[PDB]
Amino acid sequence: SIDTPNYDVQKHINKLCGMLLITEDANHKFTGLIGMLYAMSRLGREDTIKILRDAGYHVKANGVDVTTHRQDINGKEMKFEVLTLASLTTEIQINIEIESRKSYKKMLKEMGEVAPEYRHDSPDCGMIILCIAALVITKLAAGDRSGLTAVIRRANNVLKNEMKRYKGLLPKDIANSFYEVFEKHPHFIDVFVHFGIAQSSTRGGSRVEGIFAGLFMNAYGL
């Protein structure tokens, strides 16, 4: 059973990536998975399944819906928008949002107001996460995590502006999370490569879409 998010949940996954990105000392244990869910939501359900089935994988597609979860958090009943995912519990998704709200409160106090580029819902949050994946993909051939140092050094240079925008953009933690998903679920390698090849045809004014395209092309010999 594999979760196959469609276009309708793409914006929600982007916001979930953004929640991790605004979180100081974020627990990036699920970031590799969330990043891959974002890439699958860009491809859409039909293309994801085609990629997996064509690559010889036997996949039982799990539809991904946005639902409301009511939960008592510190005495008060709270409403949370979560995804129905076999790979990611409601609890984990809610804890990510709760932690992000604590970092948001801290930032709002220090800055006074939070400009668009510092927000968890900025349109480029999912692509920021996938830039780390584009670096990790170059180092998978070694069959070990030896390339981690080089991924961190490269991310600190290429994602300098994105790192100034987001306290949760911790290349070591995010890169290890991608190494983990690519090692545990090698079907995500195929999904990531097909996503990158399809993304190359994106023509727009997004800095991070441009950074991603450059990093993805570099994995091919630049």
DSSP for 139-175, written as a single string? TGGGSSSTTHHHHHHHHHHHTHHHHHH-TT--HHHHH
**Which of the 8 DSSP states describes residue 7?**
G
What's the angle, vertex CA 74, arms to CA 72 and CA 79, rounded to 5? Answer: 40
Could you tell me the residue ranges of all domains in the chain?
A: 1-222
- C-alpha distances (whole Å) from 201 to each of 6, 198, 209 are 19, 6, 10
Tokens 């195929």 correspond to what residue?
A: 190
Q: Are 117 and 165 in contact (CB under 8 A)?
A: yes
The distance in angstroms from the start CA to the end CA of the chain is 37
Distance of CA 101 to the CA centre of its chain: 18
Residue type, 218: N
d(CA 217, CA 86): 32
Locate the DSSP E strands across the chain: 2-4, 61-63, 66-73, 76-83
